[PDB]
């Protein structure tokens, strides 16, 4: 505490208003937590368990990101499901049908069908998300396609920065496509892209490791990574955002520009201390 | 908001939690016993404060093979901080301490306070904030606060010594003589 | 170089100081007694193992109004590298946490050791670094290890209950249970 | 602890080897901090009072950074010297001529004059740098020149951004000129071109804040920064390296090749675990 002799209003007021912006912080801090509270309080291992009883085959991918955040029920991406399902017929609105039909047979729990996946609501409430899968492997999504990208490397790659971020990866990409999704659908990222967006964007990060710091830094970064294809490190393509063409063109320039305005939205909020307009931004 | 305040017995811990008391806060104290050679005079310091401003201290208690006397003691304030949260229920909300400019100890730079922030932000997503709301100030700026605070400077004690009368010689004496303090 | 470990009575940090030592560290030992459940058995599977070893163990104590059971305590692991620096003596060379991966809780993550190692180098302009060997190990390859370290696993303790038979649903119960401990 | 049942030779070896690096980052540290035991003991209030009793006048600005580390006693930079002494004759080596002089008088301490400063050596071993200034303010530096920064504003950004590194801004720069000191004359870059960049470094500084972490990164950060004329915030010059002509030249291509090769040599060295390679570094 000693200066050894080394040696208002302006500084008083600076003072109160630093406070106010470090309690808001807290403030919103809470609110990131209540959004999170069913995934961070998911029974993980109830999960696991559940999966190897009503299991045409399960897929070898660990996953078991199936909690909703924000009210948003639902599932575009790798980071909403619990396990993928491959379908063994040899023949995507169809192989969800058939995962659904054999599943509640064996099942204990009512079983049923949404836009992307199959969702098991067992006795106790607790709804399992499984995303059906063909060999060829290859997951859904654009309806009725199935998509490029390659479900092995996500999942790889979702669940090692996800432990290099102490598990708050997940959280902060589900808090990302719950801000998105209040945008217009024609306006909005897929969800295979926005988590390969949060792999580029975490992959290197150097800030606090908490939702409420990284969910600016999502944003703010990939409103610039969007401009270019996406690619890992080595720089070959990860496939998965070739609907949007080639770098700088006019669909990722609109893209930027609404990933940026959420950003300054995110920032703004902040700024006036509006705990309604943090809320607005997920509904 | 609820702030815990590290309180010391001097005027800058003082003047953090009159602050945080005027902006409307619910305040609580907390103040470590660690075997320094000032904690009678410290402790005596806090319970007049705290007293007087209204507010409760959780006291915490350390003990380890030491001989802790004046000047820098490597790890002190991150201790405090860390002390402030695990023993002293400081899961929530904000916690003060009352570091501040001029000092000689990288514990009480800038560098220190942003590192603290992320280990106190990290370990609660947030929920909890390290604060020092005289990170940049002077003791001559914090003197000044305190006498507009209404507390009496003979409540308060910072010789690092531990005797009575003060020692007149280590970092927080010196700061009270170029005060006339 | 010397290395102050961080024994908790587990396998876990006993393999970190078998490590450091088969290193050709000069090793001692850091348990801290801040009122747990287990700091009876745990103290005793310390002193057992640390007399193994040939290690001297400085124990370190903390009090404050608190019930600490089983599950997470916020702040601890953060609070016991700060106690081992501050009170401790840990001021230069590696201070030894024994976390490991697989655990529900931040402070076992690869960020909260990346924290660490940023405050202890910046308290001491890098003559202290925090180090945890088996960060990316889960227990059946520290289980592998201990088996190969020539130490007892009956001298080992890891229930977050206290209790004598262990409680056998706490975290670390069900990490034995799951290996057959 | 405790994962609640959520479940080598290589490992161990990958282990032993971290280990190994830990160690070597540490006696790297007490290297650091043995060359920079004079600049972090020196009595600072003594300094300044020392200054009060010698003292044609001395500027306003705040500097005592006098302290020589690694053995390098030079003194090219405003981070190198104690106070500025404007000459008040309104007539560079003749100006420190005339502080020479009058010193001697008022001085209890025997006063010397070098190749840019005066130095003051009192009875007890203290050197007290004196940087001879005009009035127009200059400092000199290219012999019998001045140099044509502004030294005002160079001493309120080093002691600012000293201050947001807890002081050891100061420090880094100290060891980096000392690093650039080993090298040929012609191939080092100016004193005051190191300062700034190091606040160009620093401003924005997000890594460890140890003079070990420290000093990698500026050099990392000027084998870029040197290829483009220095600016402040604003963009408005800060006129100290004109010398180097215009962006991308071939001098300073020349000095980013340097930069670039004593960064990889601390980087080899470190990987090395070489203590002998980076005392060779020092001289
Ligand atoms: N941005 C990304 N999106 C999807 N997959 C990725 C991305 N970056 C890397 N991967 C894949 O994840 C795995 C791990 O990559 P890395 O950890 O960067 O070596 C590899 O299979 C990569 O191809
Ligand atoms: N890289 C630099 N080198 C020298 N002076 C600088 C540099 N950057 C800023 N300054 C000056 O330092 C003062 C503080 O700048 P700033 O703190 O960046 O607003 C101003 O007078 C700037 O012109
Ligand atoms: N014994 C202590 N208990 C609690 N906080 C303390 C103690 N000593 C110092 N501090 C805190 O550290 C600051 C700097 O000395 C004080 O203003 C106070 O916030
Ligand atoms: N009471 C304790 N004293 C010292 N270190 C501890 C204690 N409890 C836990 N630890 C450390 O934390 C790690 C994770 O529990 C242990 O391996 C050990 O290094
Ligand atoms: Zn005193
Ligand atoms: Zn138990």
């Known amino acids: ?283 | 908001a609820e702030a815990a305040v590290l309180l010391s017995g001097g005027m800058d811990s003082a003047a953090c939690a009159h602050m945080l008391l005027r902006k409307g806060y619910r305040v609580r104290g907390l103040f470590i016993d660690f075997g320094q050679a000032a904690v009678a005079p410290e402790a005596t310091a806090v319970s007049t404060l705290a007293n007087i401003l209204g507010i409760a201290v959780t006291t915490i208690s350390a003990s380890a093979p030491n001989r802790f006397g004046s000047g820098e003691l490597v790890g002190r304030n991150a201790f405090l901080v860390m002390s402030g949260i695990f023993l002293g229920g400081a899961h929530s909300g904000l916690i003060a301490i009352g570091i501040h400019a001029g000092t000689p100890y990288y514990d009480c730079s800038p560098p220190f306070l942003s590192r603290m922030k992320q280990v106190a932000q990290e370990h609660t997503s947030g929920r909890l904030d390290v604060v020092a709301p005289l990170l940049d100030w002077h003791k001559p700026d914090i003197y000044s606060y305190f006498q507009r605070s209404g507390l009496p400077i003979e409540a308060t004690y910072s010789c690092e010594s531990g005797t009575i009368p003060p020692c007149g010689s280590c970092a927080s004496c010196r700061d009270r003589r170029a005060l006339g303090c």
Chains 1, 4 share one sequence.
């Open chain 1, 1 to 283: 505490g000693g200066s050894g002799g080394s040696f208002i209003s302006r500084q008083v007021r600076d003072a109160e208003k630093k406070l106010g912006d470090e309690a808001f912080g807290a403030k919103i801090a809470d609110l990131f937590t209540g959004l999170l509270g069913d995934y961070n309080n998911r029974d993980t291992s109830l999960v696991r368990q559940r999966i190897d009883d009503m299991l045409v085959a399960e897929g070898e991918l660990d996953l078991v990101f199936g909690g909703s955040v924000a009210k948003r029920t639902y599932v575009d991406g790798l980071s909403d499901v619990d396990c993928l399902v491959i379908v063994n017929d040899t023949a995507p609105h169809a192989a969800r049908d058939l995962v659904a039909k054999e599943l509640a047979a064996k099942l204990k729990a009512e079983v049923s069908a949404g836009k992307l996946a199959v969702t098991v609501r067992y006795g106790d409430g607790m709804e399992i998300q499984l995303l059906p899968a063909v060999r060829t492997v290859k997951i859904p999504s654009v309806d009725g396609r199935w998509s490029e990208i390659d479900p092995g490397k996500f999942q790889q790659a979702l669940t090692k920065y996800n432990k290099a971020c102490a598990g708050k990866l997940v959280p902060a990409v589900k808090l990302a496509k719950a801000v998105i999704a209040q945008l217009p659908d024609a306006h909005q990222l897929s969800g295979y892209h926005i988590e390969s967006l949060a792999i580029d964007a975490f992959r290197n990060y150097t800030g606090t490791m908490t939702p409420a710091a990284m969910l600016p830094h999502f944003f703010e970064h990939a409103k610039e990574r969007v401009l270019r294809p996406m690619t890992d490190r080595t720089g070959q393509s990860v496939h998965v955002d070739g609907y949007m063409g080639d770098a700088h063109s006019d669909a990722r320039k609109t893209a930027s520009h609404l990933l940026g305005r959420l950003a300054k939205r995110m920032a703004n909020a902040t700024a006036a201390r509006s705990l309604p307009q943090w809320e607005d931004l997920f509904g």
